[PDB]
Each structure stands twice: as C-alpha cells, then as structure tokens.
C-alpha cells in the first residue's frame, strides 16, 4: 500500500514463527522497540497488527 | 472500641505491609511493573536498565 494509505491486517487465531524472519536477514532494519531484538519476540500476544 | 489502641497499634502495621505489597507492584518509571516480562520482552543490555 502506500503512505497515507498504510494498509493494516489483524494477525488473530495462529501460531507464529518469529525467527524465520530473525534468520532472513535480508531485511535491512530489523530494529524492535519494546520488544526484544534477539529473537526473544516469540511471546504470547492477544492481538498482532500488520 | 475498648482496646482502641492495640487495634490502632495493628492496623498500622497491616497497612504498612499491605502498603509494601501494593509498592511492589509498581511501574517505578519502567516499562512494566513485572521483571519477568522485562526479561522476556528486551534483551539482556537493554533490560539490566
């Protein structure tokens, strides 16, 4: 999507696998505020917005 | 209200502890009141802040 129109999913109802995207690397800025950034994200969380 | 001041005396320091507890679970300027999930939610540098 584009800026003003920044486009929002509701991750609900699944497991996630966090560290596929850890170990990608092939994102250039990875940085996490509030969350850990070693991977520890794989936490229960009641509502994941993309 | 006879022995008003052994009461008095237990109240206080019911409320002391009950004061302590409820201390205990305080943000204190952080980012949550628990440590646990201090620990689980920032790495070990950013979390001994």
């Known amino acids: 999507a584009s800026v003003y129109a920044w486009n929002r999913k ?3 109802n699944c497991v996630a696998d966090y560290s596929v995207l850890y170990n990608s690397a092939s994102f250039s800025t990875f940085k996490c505020y509030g969350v850990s950034p070693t991977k520890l994200n794989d936490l229960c969380f009641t ?3 993309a | 209200s006879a022995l008003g001041k052994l009461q008095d005396v237990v109240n206080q320091n019911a409320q002391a502890l009950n004061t302590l507890v409820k201390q205990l679970s305080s943000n204190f300027g ?3 009141s628990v440590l646990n999930d201090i620990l689980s939610r920032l790495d070990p540098p950013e979390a001994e802040v």
Do not use: E, T
Request: net charge positive; proline share 0%; charged share 10%.
């Open chain 1, 10 to 12: 509701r991750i609900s």
């Open chain 1, 47 to 49: 509502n994941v917005y």
């Open chain 2, 30 to 32: 952080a980012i949550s």
